[PDB]
Protein: Geopilin domain 1 protein
Organism: Geobacter sulfurreducens
Amino acid sequence: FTLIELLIVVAIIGILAAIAIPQFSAYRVKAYNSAASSDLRNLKTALESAFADDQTYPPES
Amino acid sequence: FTLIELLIVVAIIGILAAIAIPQFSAYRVKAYNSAASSDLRNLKTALESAFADDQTYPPES
């Protein structure tokens, strides 16, 4: 509308364009880690189930 | 408790359910036999006692 109105908008667009976007890197690597430790604690039950069938842990591959 | 704990129990119940139970058949037939041979060796003394009373073995039945 008025030149002064178009001077507040550009003064607010500048504000709302920098709101300290956080580093969402550590908060995701923790999920990837806790998939692998879960997966290992599960894998152990398969190994120690298979031993109590065969008196041996499985052959590799 | 834990699934692995319930995998050792079933691995031991299977063991303690097959411990080579022996054939207790010959070890009992020997007792039945040695009752009858004892009984005969006793019965002979009654026959050969009764002869030395009557000059005869008993009539049958």
